[PDB]
Design a protein around this ligand. Structure first.
Ligand SMILES: Nc1nc2c(ncn2[C@@H]2O[C@H](COP(=O)(O)OP(=O)(O)OP(=O)(O)O)[C@@H](O)[C@H]2O)c(=O)[nH]1
Ligand SMILES: *[C@H]1C(=O)c2c(O)cccc2C(=O)[C@@H]1C
Ligand SMILES: *[C@H]1C(=O)c2c(O)cccc2C(=O)[C@@H]1C
Ligand SMILES: *[C@H]1C(=O)c2c(O)cccc2C(=O)[C@@H]1C
Ligand SMILES: [Cl-]
Ligand SMILES: [Cl-]
Ligand SMILES: [Cl-]
Ligand SMILES: [Mg+2]
Lengths: 121, 995, 208
């Protein structure tokens, strides 16, 4: 992560939807980071777990992505991710990310849009 | 093809078994998984034991042989006594032959320790069944066979160690009391011969593996053998010299010497005292010459973790702490043992510096024992001056935060004792550690925090005068440190530590009002600092100072115009303006503590009125608008304001209790109307949006209002003093507002907090509102039961609160159950037995308590129809449900209470407290006493549930158990013997005669 | 570099829950009793390179015990688990320890008191002394709050690699691919998203 600028850092819990069990499954808790590649100017979400530092999210903030509310939460977003490489081979996921407060979640949405617009260039 | 081993119609293919096992142990993913299921089914086949001798002879894979011995172990432990004598002798000879054979082949002995140890354990399982009564020559033959080979001699020490563990260490749960006593006496009788063999090997043994296996068995023997085998032979000297010098034997030897230190020993014998001293002297001399000197840096060594160093240092800590806790007084009175005493302690000082929390705790328990003795024992402290000085530094440098409750407690108590023994040395070490924070040499957040916790821990140990000079020096120093530090992170850390220390020295604060005021005013300034942790620390320090100094806020101090509580309240809006809601509540909670100090009723009510001014005005304006327009509640932001008003009421009620009543009176009627309004909105939202509505922030916000209203009322009623007012003013409107709302909501909208509130009401005023208890039962009983009577997992909060409610109704207002119709009373008895089958221990315990209390309640009624009908309907259901949970193995945490309940039920019949016959007519002779019939019913019930038991076993069990219906510990013993016998075939019925 | 780790302890102590949290990051709330053993590879990235645990998560319930000590053969390390909210589970620690060491005499073993997140703790700190004379490491853990959840593995890794300064490190993070959402599966994604938005996130009261 030495070739990337940190645009935004926030504590978050990340979930992935399991369509089979029809339930949200925690994927990790830790620092969610918007990283700007200094060669391509491409902004990714990289999220690592507390203590193990294992990757629970690694994907481009695609301009097509849309943050939607969850019915249960005023401090979360759900969005479809076409290609996440946290577990290795790129996979499609339905993700949910929850923050400490409505304020953190709105701030995240603001940064995620600013990142989408950097990724349009 | 792997599944071929499961087909027993054909003879077993050993090569196929060896592939499955290989695939299981060395395979991966799908293959490993399928091999696992197959091996499990093979092993669990009740005829698989017949294949064991075939597998042991013809298998190449030692893993296969391991699994074969597990199959044999299942047969030996469970069904051995069904086998003909000749077949048992066959298996015995086969197993002994496989052991001796594997030992005689040097390559197998060396490389197959797994299989040999499993074989030895299999043999010990045969000895538990057969020895000595059906195998008197076992020990003579073992002793004989030991001189034939070093491998067999070594392996025989493994058999004897396992035999000792099985008979003395692990027998309590796994054998009947009679069988355990028999095997203990049997080993005791043959021990003189076993010891001779162990002593010979130790005296003349040349092989390290043999010597270690012998010392491993000795460690097991020391748990039970008499002291004379250690003290009246050469063995103490061999342990404390020869075996400490070689590092093969040193760890096992240190563990033996720890156990030697615990032997039961005569107290009045100078020769034994000298031997106890001598083995300690020998062991410490071998450590100092062969391992490390007293000066060695054990922290560094442990950290490096070379080979077995960490285990050896842990074993050394255990040996020194165990011997010294028992024997240091032997070393204290004689000048020639002074150096040995202080060397042993100096090693403990060096062990106490190791960075290993669990080792530190072991040494801290010893230091606590020592410094407590120095605090009380005459003419002892002067011996340990230099040990104590070093220990002060080790404790101060290792102080943890008070949130780590047990460790902080132990460390505080050690440091308090040490501070008493030499206050000057403690003060100097703390001041000089503070100087190394100020000069930067040792500066870090962790270090200034650690020092602050240490300084705080010793509050109250110094004289008021010494304390004053000390506190001033520390605050002066921490303030200098504050000014000197750059950036708000460093300043926040030092500020937090100042607040921490100040909060731990209330005696200083109470004698220095001018300082206390400055502290409070500074805490108020810090409540405007949004820098993380500062507001939370300011609020925590405020309430902590208030709890301790509250009287100083309620009196007019000389040179003040008013009591400081009035000054706090007047400026409360401005003080609290930048706090998060939970910090505001803590602040109001702290003011409530102060106001409760004012015992003039008129002045207290006035302060309470002034304190509640802001939430009462916000409340009043909300109610004006809320009453004018019902729709205003829908607004997310109003819901948050309402909930925070109620939470402020809860916070003040929490500290004021009975004194809160006038404030509860001011809001009570509109609060219950708000409860109903909020309830309609939740009902409206669930209808319009579905069950999903209950997950929405809007509905969770409304539910929060209902839960905080219930929490406020339970908080007041649990501390209320005027119960007449509770019954006359609060209870009727509460029941009207909550009971029907609970009953007429869908299960997912029902608040378990209603049950919790109702429990507090019945607890406090249940005796004064018999019709109110009936109404509670009728509203919540059948509908809550229907939420929780489908599985053990749905609605866990309701499940817990439901049984707490039935428990308290059954204690305080048992009349409400008499008012239930018979069908509803049956559901109640069903509900109790349901609680018994719960794996949830909150439910199960309430279940068993309700059952106990219900018996007592029915017993109290005496000889009337309700009692008689209850026994005829439910006595045998309770007896059999209790036997079911005692025997099924899924409810072992309830064992004690299940036994108590069974004893009480059985004893009712013995004490003739059941008037009607429990048997229906023509089932038995019409004269027959309930006492005789109980035994007949129990024999029949046990016979069906446990058909492998003989009639003799059940009758002997029941004869013992019934006679012990007054003696709970003996009763429990009989039950435990029965739980052993039901796991096997052919249990001895004379076991129930144990005494 | 892979090591066989055996996880033993009473039913319902949190063995499967702890491993799953480590495997996927999820907290399984439901109790589905393990049948015999579940084997899962678990990899950590260290300053000394990747370490792999072949985790043998064994059944705690006697009735689902399967091969029992059969699972312990060639274990290089072990975790004994109890539940600090259930006294019987601590009472049983010596029984699991016994069965384990009879098969694996000289292996590093961590004793773990799980469920320290629960306020009503039944096995107090003062009571937990079994590890001392058996040279077990001990940690309070919570699979639910993640309190000390990395400690059992970091300790075992230090013992198995024979490096006391071994640290978990951040796995280097490959640049994620740019892809365009397929017009054919565009309709499909809208459906899956609708279901996920109308299912509530668990534990909405938690700090995250
Ligand atoms: N509060 C709390 N619950 C926990 C914690 N860890 C696990 N649990 C729960 O406790 C239960 C433990 O289930 P498992 O992890 O399957 O138990 P196990 O030890 O694998 O049991 P067996 O497979 O039968 O040996 C589940 O309901 C878990 O969600 C914890 O740290 N805190
Ligand atoms: C067993 C044994 O092997 C042995 C050695 O090694 C040396 C001296 C005596 C003996 C015995 O006879 C032991 C019983
Ligand atoms: C910093 C500081 O913390 C402080 C407190 O906490 C109270 C009174 C005065 C001060 C300072 O001036 C220190 C620089
Ligand atoms: C008490 C007891 O319950 C009992 C029953 O129930 C049957 C026969 C004998 C007894 C006793 O002797 C016990 C004292
Ligand atoms: Cl004895
Ligand atoms: Cl003593
Ligand atoms: Cl006072
Ligand atoms: Mg499991």
């Amino acid at each position: 992560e030495e070739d990337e600028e940190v645009l935004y850092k926030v504590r978050a819990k990340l979930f992935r939807f399991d369509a089979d069990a029809k339930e949200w499954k925690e994927r990790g808790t830790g620092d969610c980071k918007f990283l700007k590649n200094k060669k391509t100017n491409k902004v990714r979400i990289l999220m690592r777990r507390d203590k193990t530092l294992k990757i629970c999210a690694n994907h481009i903030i695609a301009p097509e992505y849309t943050l939607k509310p969850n019915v249960g939460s005023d401090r979360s977003w759900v969005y479809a991710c076409t290609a996440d490489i946290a577990e290795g081979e790129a996979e499609a996921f339905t993700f949910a990310i929850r923050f400490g407060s409505k304020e953190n979640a709105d701030k995240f949405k603001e940064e995620f849009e600013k990142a989408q617009e950097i990724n349009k260039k | 093809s792997m599944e071929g081993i499961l087909d027993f119609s054909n003879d077993l293919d050993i090569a196929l078994l060896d592939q499955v096992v290989s695939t299981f142990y060395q395979g991966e993913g799908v293959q490993q998984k399928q091999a696992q299921e197959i091996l499990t089914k093979f092993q669990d086949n009740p005829d698989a034991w017949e294949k064991a001798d075939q597998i042991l002879q013809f298998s190449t894979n030692p893993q296969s042989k391991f699994i074969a011995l597990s199959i044999l172990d299942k047969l030996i432990t469970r069904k051995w006594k069904l086998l003909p004598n000749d077949h048992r002798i066959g298996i015995r000879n086969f197993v002994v032959g496989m052991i001796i054979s594997m030992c005689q082949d040097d390559e197998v002995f060396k490389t197959q320790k797994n299989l040999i140890n499993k074989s030895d354990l299999t043999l010990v399982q045969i000895l538990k069944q057969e020895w000595p009564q059906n195998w008197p020559e076992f020990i003579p033959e073992l002793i004989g066979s030991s001189s034939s080979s070093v491998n067999v001699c070594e392996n025989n020490m493994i058999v004897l160690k396992l035999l000792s563990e099985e008979v003395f260490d692990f027998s309590a749960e796994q054998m009947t009391q009679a069988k355990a006593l028999h095997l203990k006496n049997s080993m005791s009788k043959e021990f003189e011969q076993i010891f001779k063999l162990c002593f010979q090997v130790l005296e003349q043994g040349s092989s390290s593996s043999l010597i270690v296996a012998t010392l491993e068995s000795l460690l097991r023997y020391l748990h039970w053998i008499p002291y004379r085998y250690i003290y009246e032979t050469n063995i103490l000297e061999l342990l404390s010299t020869k075996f400490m010098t070689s590092p093969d034997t040193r760890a096992i030897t240190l563990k033996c010497l720890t156990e030697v230190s615990n032997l039961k020993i005569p107290q009045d014998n100078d020769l034994i005292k000298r031997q106890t001293v001598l083995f300690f002297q020998n062991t410490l001399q071998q450590i100092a010459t062969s391992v490390m000197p007293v000066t060695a840096d054990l922290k560094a060594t442990y950290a490096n973790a070379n080979g077995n160093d960490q285990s050896f240092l842990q074993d050394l800590a255990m040996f020194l702490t165990t011997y010294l806790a028992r024997n240091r007084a032997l070393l204290e009175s004689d000048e020639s043992l002074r150096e040995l005493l202080l060397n042993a302690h100096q090693y403990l000082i060096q062990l106490s510096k190791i960075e290993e929390r669990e080792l530190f705790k072991t040494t801290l328990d010893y230091w606590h024992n020592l410094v407590a003795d120095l605090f009380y024992e005459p003419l002892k402290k002067h011996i340990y001056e230099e040990i104590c000085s070093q220990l002060r530094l080790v404790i101060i440098e290792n102080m943890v935060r008070p949130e780590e409750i047990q460790l902080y407690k132990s460390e505080r108590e050690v440091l308090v004792y040490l501070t008493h023994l030499n206050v000057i040395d403690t003060e100097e070490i703390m001041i000089s550690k503070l100087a190394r924070q100020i000069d930067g040499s040792e500066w870090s957040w962790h270090n200034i925090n650690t020092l602050s916790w240490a300084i705080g821990s010793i509050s109250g140990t110094m004289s008021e005068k010494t304390e004053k000079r000390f506190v001033v020096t520390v605050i002066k120093d921490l303030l200098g440190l504050c000014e000197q530090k750059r950036g708000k992170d460093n300043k926040a850390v030092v500020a937090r530590d100042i607040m921490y220390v100040v909060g731990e020295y209330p005696r200083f604060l109470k004698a220095h009002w001018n300082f206390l005021r400055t502290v409070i005013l500074k805490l108020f300034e810090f409540m405007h600092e949004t820098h993380e942790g500062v507001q939370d620390m300011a609020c925590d320090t405020f309430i902590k100072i208030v709890q301790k100094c509250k009287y100083h806020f309620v009196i007019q101090q000389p040179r003040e115009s008013e009591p400081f509580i009035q000054t706090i309240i007047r400026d409360i809006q401005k003080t609290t303006a930048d706090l998060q809601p939970q910090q505001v509540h803590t602040f109001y909670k702290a003011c409530g503590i102060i106001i409760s100090e004012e015992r003039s009723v008129a002045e207290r009510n006035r302060l309470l009125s002034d304190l509640m001014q802001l939430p009462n005005m916000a409340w009043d304006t909300i109610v004006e608008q809320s009453t004018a327009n019902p729709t205003l509640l829908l607004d997310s932001e109003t819901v948050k304001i309402i909930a925070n008003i109620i939470k402020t009421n809860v916070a003040v009620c929490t500290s004021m209790g009975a004194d809160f009543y006038p404030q509860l009176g001011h809001i009570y009627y509109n609060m219950l109307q708000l409860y109903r309004a909020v309830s309609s909105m939740i009902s409206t939202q669930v209808a319009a949006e579905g069950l999903i509505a209950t997950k929405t922030p809007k509905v969770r916000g409304l539910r929060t209002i209902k839960k905080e209203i219930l929490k406020l009322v339970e908080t007041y009623i649990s501390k209320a003093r005027n119960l007449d007012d509770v019954v006359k003013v609060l209870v009727e409107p509460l029941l009207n507002a909550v009971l029907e709302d609970y009953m007429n909501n869908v299960p997912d909208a029902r608040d378990a907090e209603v049950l919790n509130c109702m429990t507090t009401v019945v607890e406090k005023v249940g005796h004064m509102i018999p019709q109110g208890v009936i109404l509670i039962l009728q509203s919540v009983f059948e509908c809550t039961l229907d939420m929780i009577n489908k599985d053990f997992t749905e609605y866990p909060e309701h499940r817990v609160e439901f049984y707490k409610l039935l428990k308290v109704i059954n204690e305080k207002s048992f009349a409400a159950f008499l008012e239930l119709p018979p069908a509803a009373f049956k559901l109640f008895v069903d509900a109790i037995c349901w609680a018994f089958k719960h794996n949830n221990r909150d439910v199960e315990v309430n279940g068993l308590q309700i059952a106990l209390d219900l018996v007592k309640n029915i017993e109290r009624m005496g000889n009337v129809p309700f009692a008689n009908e209850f026994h005829k309907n439910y006595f045998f259901i309770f007896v059999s449900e209790t036997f079911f949970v005692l025997t099924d193995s899924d409810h072992k945490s309830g064992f004690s209470k299940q036994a108590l309940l069974l004893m009480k039920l059985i004893s009712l019949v013995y004490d003739n407290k059941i008037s009607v016959p429990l048997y229906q007519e023509a089932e038995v002779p019409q004269g027959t006493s309930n006492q005789v019939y109980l035994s007949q019913y129990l024999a029949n019930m046990l016979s069906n549930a446990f058909p492998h038991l003989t009639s003799e076993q059940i009758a002997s069990f029941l004869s013992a158990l019934t006679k012990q219906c007054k003696d709970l510990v003996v009763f429990k013993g009989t039950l435990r013997d029965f739980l052993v016998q039901i796991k096997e075939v052919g249990g001895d019925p004379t076991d129930y005669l144990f005494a | 570099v892979q090591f066989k780790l055996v996880l033993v302890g009473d039913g319902g102590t949190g063995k499967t829950t702890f491993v799953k949290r480590h495997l996927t990051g999820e907290f399984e709330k439901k109790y589905v009793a393990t049948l015999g053993v579940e084997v899962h590879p678990l990899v950590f990235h260290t300053n000394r390179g990747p370490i792999k645990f072949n985790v043998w998560d064994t059944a705690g319930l006697e009735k689902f015990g399967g091969l029992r000590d059969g699972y312990y053969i060639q274990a290089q390390c072990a975790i004994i688990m109890f539940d600090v909210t259930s006294r019987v589970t601590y009472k049983n620690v010596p029984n699991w320890h016994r069965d384990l060491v009879r098969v694996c005499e000289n292996i590093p073993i961590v004793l773990c008191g799980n469920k320290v997140d629960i306020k009503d703790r039944k096995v107090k700190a003062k009571s937990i002394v079994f590890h001392r004379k058996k040279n077990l490491q001990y940690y309070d853990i919570s699979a639910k709050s993640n309190y000390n959840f990395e400690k059992p593995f970091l300790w075992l890794a230090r013992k198995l690699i024979g490096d006391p300064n071994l640290e978990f490190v951040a796995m280097p993070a490959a640049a994620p691919p740019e892809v365009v959402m397929d017009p054919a599966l565009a309709a499909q994604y809208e459906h899956d998203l609708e279901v996920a938005q109308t299912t509530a996130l668990p534990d909405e009261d938690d700090d995250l």
